Write an enzyme that holds these catalytic residues in place. Structure first.
Site, PDB file in Angstrom:
ATOM      1  N   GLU A  35       0.802  -1.216  -0.072  1.00  9.42           N
ATOM      2  CA  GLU A  35       0.092   0.101   0.106  1.00  9.42           C
ATOM      3  C   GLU A  35       0.949   1.349   0.104  1.00  9.42           C
ATOM      4  O   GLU A  35       0.358   2.372  -0.801  1.00  9.42           O
ATOM      5  CB  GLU A  35      -0.892  -0.198   1.354  1.00  9.42           C
ATOM      6  CG  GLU A  35      -2.038  -1.071   0.999  1.00  9.42           C
ATOM      7  CD  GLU A  35      -3.068  -0.733   0.076  1.00  9.42           C
ATOM      8  OE1 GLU A  35      -3.138   0.532  -0.415  1.00  9.42           O
ATOM      9  OE2 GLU A  35      -4.125  -1.466   0.018  1.00  9.42           O
ATOM     10  N   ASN A  46      -7.715   9.426  -5.366  1.00 12.63           N
ATOM     11  CA  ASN A  46      -8.570   8.540  -5.905  1.00 12.63           C
ATOM     12  C   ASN A  46      -9.379   9.028  -7.024  1.00 12.63           C
ATOM     13  O   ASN A  46      -9.520  10.313  -6.936  1.00 12.63           O
ATOM     14  CB  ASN A  46      -9.361   7.825  -4.781  1.00 12.63           C
ATOM     15  CG  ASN A  46      -8.442   7.167  -3.675  1.00 12.63           C
ATOM     16  OD1 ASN A  46      -8.780   7.320  -2.590  1.00 12.63           O
ATOM     17  ND2 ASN A  46      -7.454   6.513  -4.123  1.00 12.63           N
ATOM     18  N   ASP A  48     -12.474   9.306  -7.370  1.00 13.73           N
ATOM     19  CA  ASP A  48     -13.759   9.904  -6.802  1.00 13.73           C
ATOM     20  C   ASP A  48     -13.399  11.135  -6.289  1.00 13.73           C
ATOM     21  O   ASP A  48     -14.277  11.732  -5.595  1.00 13.73           O
ATOM     22  CB  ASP A  48     -14.392   8.780  -6.111  1.00 13.73           C
ATOM     23  CG  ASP A  48     -13.993   8.536  -4.870  1.00 13.73           C
ATOM     24  OD1 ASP A  48     -12.712   8.864  -4.514  1.00 13.73           O
ATOM     25  OD2 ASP A  48     -14.446   7.873  -3.762  1.00 13.73           O
ATOM     26  N   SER A  50     -11.572  11.364  -3.170  1.00 11.83           N
ATOM     27  CA  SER A  50     -10.873  11.139  -2.018  1.00 11.83           C
ATOM     28  C   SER A  50      -9.494  10.829  -2.312  1.00 11.83           C
ATOM     29  O   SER A  50      -8.953  10.932  -3.225  1.00 11.83           O
ATOM     30  CB  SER A  50     -11.560   9.974  -1.691  1.00 11.83           C
ATOM     31  OG  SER A  50     -11.405   8.716  -2.227  1.00 11.83           O
ATOM     32  N   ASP A 101     -15.568  -3.707   9.305  1.00 14.79           N
ATOM     33  CA  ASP A 101     -16.274  -2.945   8.587  1.00 14.79           C
ATOM     34  C   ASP A 101     -17.036  -4.083   7.871  1.00 14.79           C
ATOM     35  O   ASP A 101     -18.450  -3.625   7.303  1.00 14.79           O
ATOM     36  CB  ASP A 101     -15.862  -2.122   7.755  1.00 14.79           C
ATOM     37  CG  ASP A 101     -16.877  -1.339   6.746  1.00 14.79           C
ATOM     38  OD1 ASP A 101     -17.835  -0.650   7.328  1.00 14.79           O
ATOM     39  OD2 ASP A 101     -16.853  -1.283   5.637  1.00 14.79           O
TER      40      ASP A 101
END
Ligand code: NA
Length: 129
Positions: A35, A46, A48, A50, A101
Site C-alpha cells: 500500500e 483516488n 472519486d 478522495s 467493517d
C-alpha cells in the site's frame, strides 16, 4: 517515516494487529509494503476525489477528514493528516475499525491483489518478535 520491515512488524504487534480479526501479522506487514512502501507520509489521490493516507492508505471517503472530499464520512474521527505521523497509533486504531467493517482485509486493494493467498508469514521472517 519510512519503517524497516521488522521495525513495522514490531510496532504493529505492540498495537495489537497480530491476529486481529484473524489476520496474522504478516498480512498487515505485506499490506503496508504494497500500500505505502512502509512510508507513513504516503498519499494517493483516488478517482472519486478522495485520497488515501499513510502506511495503510486509509481513505478519506469514509475514515478521516481531509476537508476536500465532499459528502464523505469521518468514521475514525480524525484529520487525515494524523495518519501521516511517524506515530502509527492513529493508523492502527483506524485500521482496526476498517477491518471490522464487513469485508475484512479486502478493504486494502493491494492486500487483496498482492498478499491474499500468498505466504504472508515470509513478511516477518527473521524478525525478533
Ligand atoms: Na472524510
Amino acid at each position: 517515516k519510512v519503517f524497516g520491515r521488522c521495525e513495522l512488524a514490531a510496532a504493529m504487534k505492540r498495537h495489537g494487529l497480530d491476529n486481529y480479526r484473524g489476520y496474522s501479522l504478516g498480512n498487515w506487514v505485506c499490506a503496508a509494503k504494497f500500500e505505502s512502501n512502509f512510508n507513513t507520509q504516503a498519499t494517493n489521490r483516488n478517482t472519486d476525489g478522495s485520497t488515501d493516507y499513510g502506511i495503510l492508505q486509509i481513505n478519506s471517503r469514509w475514515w478521516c477528514n481531509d476537508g476536500r472530499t465532499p459528502g464523505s464520512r469521518n468514521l475514525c474521527n480524525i484529520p487525515c493528516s494524523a495518519l501521516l505521523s511517524s506515530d502509527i497509533t492513529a493508523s492502527v486504531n483506524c485500521a482496526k475499525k476498517i477491518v471490522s467493517d464487513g469485508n475484512g482485509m479486502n478493504a486494502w486493494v493491494a492486500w487483496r491483489n498482492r498478499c491474499k493467498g500468498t505466504d504472508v508469514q515470509a513478511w516477518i521472517r527473521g524478525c525478533r518478535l
